[PDB]
């Protein structure tokens, strides 16, 4: 199953991301279940918002919110929930939510999948609008769900993103 | 063309709404052009948000923002931009934006189109979530567009909605 | 507007069909308004059914149900409501509904648009499943709408279809 | 795999439903294969009909038609085939088909996923149109498939639905 | 109708493009009819190809193929056939087809619609992949339609694109 | 998982095909991963092309390109990536690509799923356009990916298709 997908071929520079939610999709917040590897409906989000990129996680990692580390993956066409994409980290939106520190990595498709993103080396190379849209999404998408909240702490670079990937991997390792 | 569509068969209780944007659609903000009756792209909205209902206007009306009065129309399936739907007003979100007072009517499909909405007589009969989603949309959808802004002033009932329809009609009449 | 589209380049063998409803679409029953040429929502259909083909009419014709003659147009991909397709009649489903005799022509895309349908010369060349699906649709799609009903009278050939096209044209002519 | 999903967290009041067919989808009748847990095409349905709700089953149950008990799940947006949704039973359409007694449960998203359905406590709280659409679907969707048929026996309440869930669970247990 | 849309607010730098075909759509080749302003199906294209950008024309212009000058418009989300978008020319693919010289302009959404494309000043600023995809599309999309063909002659810059816009306008003027 | 799906119920006449890419979809080239059974993004294809049929493979087979044998499956509606369809082989497009001989089987839905394809007994019964579209797709879809290429060698009949299925099965058996 997806439970057996490696974190990556050469972490943290070469990772696999398991997709749960496509970019620009209906507000169904799917999460993979750790036990079964199945896609569960976590919730129907209450705001009229969509994820600006495909959204998922790195397998065999653990954030402080008790889930694998979260990843946004821009692509030319939305991905299928439950599919896996090889990518390269380029930046990270630091943020905290009701479940703990909960960073949002941005990783682009690996050069082997496409040349489209090769030019995006670091966080400054991401379009300013996309970055603004992502921060605005995480700032507001929980606005109508009581007991759910976010404190966005800011954008950081590809090396901070890599550091977060290592830490999350090591954390799933030693817990 | 759509330029020749009546405001309604018996205003303000029985109106026609010209749809510009479907519910739950991509963030393309279409507006009908007054001159040609064609659907123009006003803009690509910058936030990752969607209209909670189909969105358009009552022909032969004028708001203080210099456009025909705006209407949200809930339906079971999204409508085609440029189509026209017979409806019944049930409530209004009072609000102001950078172009003037700019109320958002809510009108449901007429009984003749469907029985689904007959039970919605007044604003209190609208689902609380939908109303919350609409106010949250108008509060935030201009957050990333400089020089565009909104002050949401609150929900009011079917009679206030009807009053607004009359006023907007009379205004297109005497300007 | 669509109000000015000819019935066809050489009726009844070479016709234009104005599309109102795409094949396999949501159950929104659009009808063009004769006055304005705009697409109106006639109703939200109540059964969980879809049109097996794109559905519309021949302009400048009149059936006994007081509307232009109805046409089903099979295509490889669903058409846009309000678009126009050049076609060739191949058969007709005779039927009556609450508004009068109300035949359903089947016309395929003209050879100039595609070679795909050239082999369909007459009604027997239509797939048996499609014909069965169309009759079953018209038999049941009004089952949950009181005061709406259908009596399906059977399939007839391309020459009967042509005769119906002529009659409907002549009727719009002399009324 | 989906083969390992529990019937529920607290049956019969708190269940999981494995979705096979989304609401308002193309007429591809997917069924999960018991052996592999994969989604198989059972058939391409022959009528021009769609499921009024998402459709699937409760894992680790068995109906008299030799399959897990069937469930319809209304949601605001169609679900992905192969996804799992936590729900609450509210009613049941009793019916028989060519494979045995084959009830159709209706279960709404659990409060934890959404508040939208909390107000639906029992079968009378379901919209009359949706219930009519579901009965009409099961009455007719097999009309063009020889050797497939249905006898719809009627709507019953949340306690009958719960009783059916218990019986189906116990049956998978003791066979 | 769309027949009355200006070529632009300040040609050739500020133009309007009437869209006939969305980006990444089914292979239905719609063309606006000059007489009626309606969207007609020109043909169902025979290759398994899609337009890499939204496709349409500048009103009140004339190419040597006897149609208004053709335009590709990249956008973040596909546009509706029959809609109009304000844009800025940035490049041109020179090519000839069976109907005459038939250049393909590329024009991006005007800054007023979006800031996304402001950075694209000239043809070299267009992504190399998109340009390659467009040339490959026009080279092959007529491969399976006998009597239809293309000779692609190459990419040229924003000033050549502007020159072509002027010439096409002047040609509709003096014929 | 899909790793455990049989090659078929009675090879080579009665096979199962695991679908990776739907017909007429976005150009995301998914491949099932042999290790995990998960759907991976192999690449984002560079040409503006789509698969004319659903595309996938026969499990427990091996081609000379080191992957299971490839299959195109025409259906009335596109299939879900990761779903499985029972089918009957009717023809084969012989071709070679950069990874080895790499035939493309065509197999239609089994009679048990639908009667629609029963009339297609052999390769000559496939529509000429579909066959032309498939050959044109494989001839050009790698045109913009350096180091990827195809030599299409021609269409052959249902018995050649069956022979290829046997050979590929036996090859996965003895390697
Ligand atoms: Cl790992
Ligand atoms: Cl979060
Ligand atoms: Cl930002
Ligand atoms: Cl009026
Ligand atoms: Cl507004
Ligand atoms: Cl509110
Ligand atoms: Cl005429
Ligand atoms: Cl009818
Ligand atoms: Cl029949
Ligand atoms: Cl269980
Ligand atoms: Cl059933
Ligand atoms: Cl009922
Ligand atoms: Cl002009
Ligand atoms: Cl061309
Ligand atoms: Cl190029
Ligand atoms: Cl096997
Ligand atoms: Cl290949
Ligand atoms: Cl061929
Ligand atoms: F998470
Ligand atoms: F407005
Ligand atoms: F009619
Ligand atoms: F079942
Ligand atoms: F043209
Ligand atoms: F392969
Ligand atoms: Mn959305
Ligand atoms: Mn969560
Ligand atoms: Mn997560
Ligand atoms: Mn979180
Ligand atoms: Mn998280
Ligand atoms: Mn959206
Ligand atoms: Mn505006
Ligand atoms: Mn407005
Ligand atoms: Mn406004
Ligand atoms: Mn306004
Ligand atoms: Mn439908
Ligand atoms: Mn009617
Ligand atoms: Mn009609
Ligand atoms: Mn009728
Ligand atoms: Mn009629
Ligand atoms: Mn459908
Ligand atoms: Mn079954
Ligand atoms: Mn079942
Ligand atoms: Mn059954
Ligand atoms: Mn059953
Ligand atoms: Mn396509
Ligand atoms: Mn042309
Ligand atoms: Mn053109
Ligand atoms: Mn041309
Ligand atoms: Mn041209
Ligand atoms: Mn496509
Ligand atoms: Mn490959
Ligand atoms: Mn393969
Ligand atoms: Mn290959
Ligand atoms: Mn292969
Ligand atoms: Na979407
Ligand atoms: Na909250
Ligand atoms: Na949408
Ligand atoms: Na703003
Ligand atoms: Na559909
Ligand atoms: Na009726
Ligand atoms: Na649908
Ligand atoms: Na039957
Ligand atoms: Na598409
Ligand atoms: Na050609
Ligand atoms: Na598609
Ligand atoms: Na190549």
From Swiss-Prot, chains A, B, C, D, E, F:
Q: Which Enzyme Commission number(s) are listed? A: 3.6.1.1
Annotated coiled-coil segments of the chain: none
Q: Does Membrane show up as a keyword for this record?
A: no
The membrane spanning regions, by residue number, are none
Q: Which InterPro entries match?
A: Pyrophosphatase (IPR008162), Pyrophosphatase_sf (IPR036649)
**Which HAMAP family did the record assign?**
Inorganic_PPase (MF_00209)
Q: What is this protein called?
A: Inorganic pyrophosphatase
Organism, per UniProt? Answer: Escherichia coli (strain K12)
């Amino acid at each position: 199953s997806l439970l057996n997908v490696p974190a990556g071929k050469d972490l943290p520079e070469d990772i696999y991301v398991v997709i749960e939610i496509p970019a620009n999709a209906d507000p169904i917040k799917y999460e993979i279940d750790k036990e079964s590897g199945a896609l569960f409906v976590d919730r129907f989000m209450s705001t009229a918002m969509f994820y600006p990129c495909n959204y998922g996680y790195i397998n065999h990692t653990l954030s402080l919110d008790g889930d694998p580390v979260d990843v946004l993956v821009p692509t030319p066409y939305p991905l299928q929930p439950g599919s896996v994409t090889r990518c390269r980290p380029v930046g990270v939106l630091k943020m905290t939510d009701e479940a703990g520190e909960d960073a949002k990595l941005v990783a682009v498709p690996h050069s082997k999948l496409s040349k489209e993103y090769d030019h995006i080396k670091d966080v400054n190379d991401l379009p300013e609008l996309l970055k603004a849209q992502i921060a605005h999404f995480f700032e507001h998408y929980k606005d109508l769900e009581k007991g759910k909240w976010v404190k966005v702490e800011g954008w950081e670079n590809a090396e901070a993103a890599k550091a977060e990937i290592v830490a999350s991997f090591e954390r799933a390792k030693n817990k």
